[PDB]
Curated annotation (Swiss-Prot), chain C:
Reported function: Lysosomal amino acid transporter involved in the activation of mTORC1 in response to amino acid levels. Probably acts as an amino acid sensor of the Rag GTPases and Ragulator complexes, 2 complexes involved in amino acid sensing and activation of mTORC1, a signaling complex promoting cell growth in response to growth factors, energy levels, and amino acids. Following activation by amino acids, the Ragulator and Rag GTPases function as a scaffold recruiting mTORC1 to lysosomes where it is in turn activated.
Family: Belongs to the amino acid/polyamine transporter 2 family. SLC38A9 subfamily.
Membrane topology annotation: Multi-pass membrane protein
Organism: Danio rerio (Zebrafish)
Binding locations of arginine: S15
Any single GO CC term annotated in Swiss-Prot or TrEMBL for this entry: late endosome
Organism placement in taxonomy: Eukaryota, Metazoa, Chordata, Craniata, Vertebrata
Full-protein residues shown: 108 to 549 of 549
Superkingdom field: Eukaryota
Keywords annotated in UniProt: Amino-acid transport, Disulfide bond, Endosome, Glycoprotein, Lysosome, Membrane, Metal-binding, Sodium, Transmembrane, Transmembrane helix, Transport
Topological domain spans for side Cytoplasmic: 196-211
Gene label: slc38a9
Annotated knockout phenotype: Homozygote knockout fishs for the SLC38A9 show no morphological difference at 12 and 24 hours post-fertilization (hpf). However, a quarter exhibit pericardial edema and small eyes at 48 hpf; the abnormal phenotypes became severe at 72 hpf. The overall body length is decreased at 24 and 72 hpf. While mutant larvae with development defects died at 4-7 dpf, those normally developed have the same viability as wide type and exhibit normal fertility.
Subunit structure: Associated component of the Ragulator complex. Associated component of the Rag GTPases heterodimers (RRAGA and RRAGC).
Protein name: Neutral amino acid transporter 9
Length: 214, 215, 364
C-alpha cells in the first residue's frame, strides 16, 4: 500500500519560514523520484521542482529558485521542502508526488499540506448548537464562529453519524472564519436519541462537544 | 516553457454521455511515446492519475476513461458519465525541463431538476448570553447550482451582515447546498419579532419562504 | 595492415557495451579524460614487454598466472550473465519500437522463461575446439560493425541534448572516476597475447602498428558511449538511468536491438567453448576431469541468477588483473631488468596507480 503522508497545516508569518515533509512507505525510496506541486486558489497547479534520491540531484523551475529548497532523509524515507521568506501570495496547498522516469507520470500523491501566510492571531472557535424552531424529517445544525487558522474538524456523534451531513466550507470575514454544518435525521430519531456536535481546532488546543437540545 | 491551452474551461454533461476535454500544446511533447497525462482532482483531495503517456490507462481507473492524441493536440473522453466524475481535470507534460499544467476543466454533472429543502434556525441561548445573535438558513440538496436567497426583518429586505457558503457538487446525487447565516447583535435582534428567509429557484415561480417569530 | 585490424578486432567485443555507464559514473568531461589517460598508459604498458617467461623468476613466480586466471574467470561469467540477458530477450521476441526505458531493477510466460540454467545444458555439451574458432572470428567482425551502425543510427534518431553543469543530468566531474578506470582496464584485453602475436608480422618499427590499433580502439570506444551518453533522452528521462549494459536501456522488442543482441549471442556462444575449453583448462593444469568445467560454469551460473550487474564485475576483475599484469609487472620487470634520472619515480607512480585502482573500487 504505497503511501505519502505529509506534515500538518502550517501558519507562517510574513517573512517567516517553514519546512514541509512527506513520508514515503510501501516502495523502495531510491528507485523513484520525488516531485512537489503548488495549487493556488482557482489557478491551476504549478510544478515547483523535483529531486532524484539515488544521486541527490534537484531541478527547480526558475519561478521558484529562491523559495523552495529540497532535502531528502535517505534513511527516514521522507522528502522535505523548505519555503523561505513567505508573503501573502505563497498561501496555497502544496502537494508532493512520486514519479518514475519515462514510463510514468506522477502516480501517487500526498494528501496535501495547507499553508496560510498571515499575521493574524490564532483564536479558538465558539460553537453554538442550532436548535429546531413538523412531521416530515428534521434537520439539525452546528455553528462554528470566530476562529483562525483554517483546519477545524467537525463530526456528529463522534463519527457514528455520517449520512445526511453537509459540512460547509469556511468563509473569511475580517480575519476570522465561520463554519456551519447540518444533519437531517428522521423525526422518530430526534430528540429521542442524543445528537451532539464535535468541533476540534488543534491550533488552539480546543475540543468542544455540543449537544443539540430543543 | 511549454504552454498547455486546455478547452473548454467549464463543461456540463448529462449522465450517460461523452465529455470531450481537449489539450493543445505550444511546442511538441512527443519524444518517442508522447508525454502527456490526464489527472482528476476532487475538492480537498489529492489529484488522481487517470491516463499516462496520453493513451495508456492506469490500473484501477475505470475503462470509461479513454485518451487519444499525439504531438500537439490531445483529447480526453469519459465514455459514459457517472456522478463520481464531478471534479476538475488537468493535463500535465513531463517532457521539458519546466513541467507545466493546463488551466483545468471543471466538469458539472447535469441531473434532473431538484428543489431545495429549506430550514431556518434562530440564534442560540449560549449565543445571546455572550452577546450577538445570528440566523441560519440551510438550503440542502437542490439542482441546479444557480439560486438566490433574500432576507427580511419585519418585511424589511435587509442586506447588510450576510455570509454565504456553497458545497461542491455532491458526488452521489449531484446536488448542491448552501448555508446563509445572517449575523446581527443581541440588541438589534431583539428590536424585531419576525425574521424570514426567502429562497427562489428554477423549480418555482413562487419563492420558498421559511419564517419565524422571535417570541 | 592486417595486424592493426587483427588487434582492433580482438580487443573489442563485449568490453565496450559498458562504457557510457562508466562515463555516467565518472562524468562526461571527466570520462573522456579518463579514456585518454587510460589509453596512453595502456598503450604504454603494452610497449613494455620486450608473458610467463618474462614474469618467471624473481621470487614471485606463478602469481601472475592466478591474476591472469582472474581475467579468464570473469570473462566466462560475463558471457553467462550476458547470454541470459540476450537469450531471454531473443525468446521474448515471438509472433503470438523506438523506445528508451530506465529499467526497473531487482532481477505463465514469466517465471519459466528466465532461467539461465536452460542455457547450461547446451554449454556443458560443447565444452569438450578448432571447429569453434573456424565458426568464430567471422561473427565478431559482424557484431561490432553492426553495433556501431546501431549506436550511430540510434543516436541520429534522437540525439543532441547535454547541458553541462541536475536531476535530469549528471555532474561532469563525478567522484566515481575510479570505477570507470576499473572497467576501462579490461578494455585493453590483450596484455597477454601481444608478444605471442607481434612477431607473427614482419616486425621492426611494429611499434607504429601497435600504437595505431590503440588509437583506433581508443577512438572506437570513445566514439561509442559518447553518442549513447550524449544522446540518451536526458530531459524526459535522465542520466543515472543508463544501467551498465547500454543495450539494457531498450526494452522487450526493438528490431535493431534484437539483431545486435543475437549477433552478440552467436558471437559469444562460439567464443566461450574456445575461451574455456582450450584456454582455462591449459592454464590450470600448468572421462578424465569434467569437474573443473563445473566450477567455471557454476560460478557464472550462480552469478547470473543472483547479482547480474555487469559493471560490478568489469571493475574488480578488470581492475585486479590490471593492477597485476597491466601495471605491477611491467614497471618491476623494466626496473629489475634495467641492467634513475626520473625513470624509477615515474615507474613507481604507475605501480601506485594500479594499487589505487583496486583500492578505489572498494571505496565509494
Amino acid at each position: 500500500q504505497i503511501q505519502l503522508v505529509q506534515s500538518g497545516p502550517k501558519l507562517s508569518k510574513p517573512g517567516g519560514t517553514d519546512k514541509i515533509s512527506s513520508k514515503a512507505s510501501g516502495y523502495s525510496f531510491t528507485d523513484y523520484v520525488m516531485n512537489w506541486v503548488k495549487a493556488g486558489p482557482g489557478k491551476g497547479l504549478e510544478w515547483n521542482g523535483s529531486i532524484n534520491t539515488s544521486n541527490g540531484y534537484t531541478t527547480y523551475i526558475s519561478a521558484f529558485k529562491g523559495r523552495g529548497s529540497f532535502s531528502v532523509d535517505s534513511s527516514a524515507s521522507t522528502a522535505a521542502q523548505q519555503l523561505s521568506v513567505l508573503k501573502a501570495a505563497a498561501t496555497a496547498v502544496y502537494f508532493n508526488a512520486r514519479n518514475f522516469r519515462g514510463n510514468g507520470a506522477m502516480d501517487y500523491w500526498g494528501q496535501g499540506t495547507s499553508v496560510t501566510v498571515s499575521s493574524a492571531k490564532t483564536t479558538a472557535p465558539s460553537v453554538y448548537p442550532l436548535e429546531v424552531s413538523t412531521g416530515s424529517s428534521v434537520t439539525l445544525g452546528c455553528l462554528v464562529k470566530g476562529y483562525f487558522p483554517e483546519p477545524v474538524t467537525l463530526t456528529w456523534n463522534s463519527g457514528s453519524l455520517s449520512s445526511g451531513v453537509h459540512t460547509f466550507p469556511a468563509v473569511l470575514a475580517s480575519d476570522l472564519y465561520t463554519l456551519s454544518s447540518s444533519v437531517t435525521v428522521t423525526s422518530s430519531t430526534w430528540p429521542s436519541q442524543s445528537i451532539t456536535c464535535n468541533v476540534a481546532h488543534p491550533a488552539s488546543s480546543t475540543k468542544v462537544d455540543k449537544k443539540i437540545e430543543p | 516553457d511549454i504552454l498547455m491551452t486546455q478547452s473548454p474551461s467549464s463543461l456540463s454533461v448529462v449522465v450517460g454521455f461523452y465529455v470531450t476535454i481537449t489539450s493543445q500544446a505550444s511546442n511538441n511533447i512527443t519524444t518517442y511515446s508522447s508525454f502527456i497525462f490526464w489527472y482528476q482532482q476532487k475538492p480537498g483531495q489529492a489529484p488522481k492519475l487517470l491516463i499516462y503517456d496520453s493513451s495508456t490507462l492506469e490500473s484501477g481507473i475505470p475503462g470509461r476513461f479513454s485518451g487519444s492524441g499525439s504531438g500537439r493536440d490531445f483529447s480526453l473522453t469519459i465514455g459514459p458519465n457517472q456522478p463520481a466524475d464531478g471534479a476538475t481535470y488537468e493535463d500535465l507534460q513531463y517532457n521539458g525541463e519546466v513541467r507545466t499544467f493546463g488551466g483545468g476543466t471543471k466538469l458539472e454533472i447535469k441531473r434532473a431538476d431538484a428543489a431545495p429543502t429549506v430550514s431556518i434556525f434562530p440564534p442560540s441561548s449560549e449565543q445571546l448570553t455572550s452577546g450577538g445573535a445570528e440566523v441560519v438558513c440551510f438550503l440542502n440538496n437542490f439542482y441546479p447550482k444557480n439560486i438566490n436567497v433574500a432576507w427580511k426583518i419585519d418585511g424589511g429586505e435587509r442586506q447588510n451582515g450576510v455570509l454565504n457558503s456553497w458545497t461542491d457538487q455532491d458526488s452521489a446525487d449531484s446536488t448542491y447546498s448552501m448555508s446563509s447565516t445572517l449575523t446581527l447583535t443581541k440588541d438589534e435582534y431583539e428590536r424585531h419579532a419576525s425574521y424570514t428567509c426567502e429562497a427562489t429557484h428554477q423549480t418555482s415561480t413562487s419563492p420558498i419562504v421559511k419564517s419565524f417569530n422571535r417570541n | 595492415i592486417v595486424t592493426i585490424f587483427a588487434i582492433w578486432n580482438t580487443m573489442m567485443g563485449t568490453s565496450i557495451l559498458s562504457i557510457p555507464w562508466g562515463i555516467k559514473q565518472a562524468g562526461f568531461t571527466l570520462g573522456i579524460i579518463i579514456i585518454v589517460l587510460m589509453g596512453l598508459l595502456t598503450l604504454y604498458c603494452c610497449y613494455r614487454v620486450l608473458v610467463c617467461k618474462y614474469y618467471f623468476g624473481g621470487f614471485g613466480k606463478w602469481s601472475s598466472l592466478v591474476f591472469s586466471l582472474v581475467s579468464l574467470i570473469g570473462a566466462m561469467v560475463v558471457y553467462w550473465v550476458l547470454m541470459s540477458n540476450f537469450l531471454f530477450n531473443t525468446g521474448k521476441f515471438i509472433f503470438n519500437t523506438e523506445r528508451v526505458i530506465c529499467p526497473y531493477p531487482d532481477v505463465g510466460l514469466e517465471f519459466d522463461h528466465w532461467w539461465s540454467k536452460t542455457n547450461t545444458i547446451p554449454f556443458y555439451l560443447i565444452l569438450l575446439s578448432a571447429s569453434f574458432f573456424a565458426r568464430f572470428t567471422f561473427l565478431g567482425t559482424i557484431s561490432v560493425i553492426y553495433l556501431i551502425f546501431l549506436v550511430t543510427y540510434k543516436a541520429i534518431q534522437l540525439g543532441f541534448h547535454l547541458e553541462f553543469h541536475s536531476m535530469f543530468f549528471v555532474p561532469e566531474f563525478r567522484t566515481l572516476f575510479p570505477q570507470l578506470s576499473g572497467v576501462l582496464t579490461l578494455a585493453f584485453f590483450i596484455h597477454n597475447c601481444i608478444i605471442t602475436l607481434m612477431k607473427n608480422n614482419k616486425h621492426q618499427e611494429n611499434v607504429r602498428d601497435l600504437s595505431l590499433a590503440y588509437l583506433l580502439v581508443g577512438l572506437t570506444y570513445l566514439y561509442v558511449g559518447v553518442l549513447i551518453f550524449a544522446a540518451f533522452p536526458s530531459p524526459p528521462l535522465s542520466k543515472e538511468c543508463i544501467e551498465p549494459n547500454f543495450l539494457d536501456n531498450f526494452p522487450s522488442s526493438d528490431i535493431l536491438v534484437f539483431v545486435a543482441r543475437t549477433f552478440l549471442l552467436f558471437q559469444m556462444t562460439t567464443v566461450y567453448p574456445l575461451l574455456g575449453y582450450l584456454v582455462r583448462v591449459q592454464l590450470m593444469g600448468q572421462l578424465h576431469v569434467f569437474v573443473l568445467n563445473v566450477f567455471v560454469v557454476g560460478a557464472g551460473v550462480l552469478m547470473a541468477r543472483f547479482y547480474p550487474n555487469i559493471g560490478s564485475i568489469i571493475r574488480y576483475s578488470g581492475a585486479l588483473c590490471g593492477l597485476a599484469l597491466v601495471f605491477v609487472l611491467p614497471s618491476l620487470i623494466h626496473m629489475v631488468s634495467l641492467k634513475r634520472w626520473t625513470s624509477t619515480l615515474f615507474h613507481g607512480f604507475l605501480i601506485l596507480l594500479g594499487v589505487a585502482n583496486l583500492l578505489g573500487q572498494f571505496f565509494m
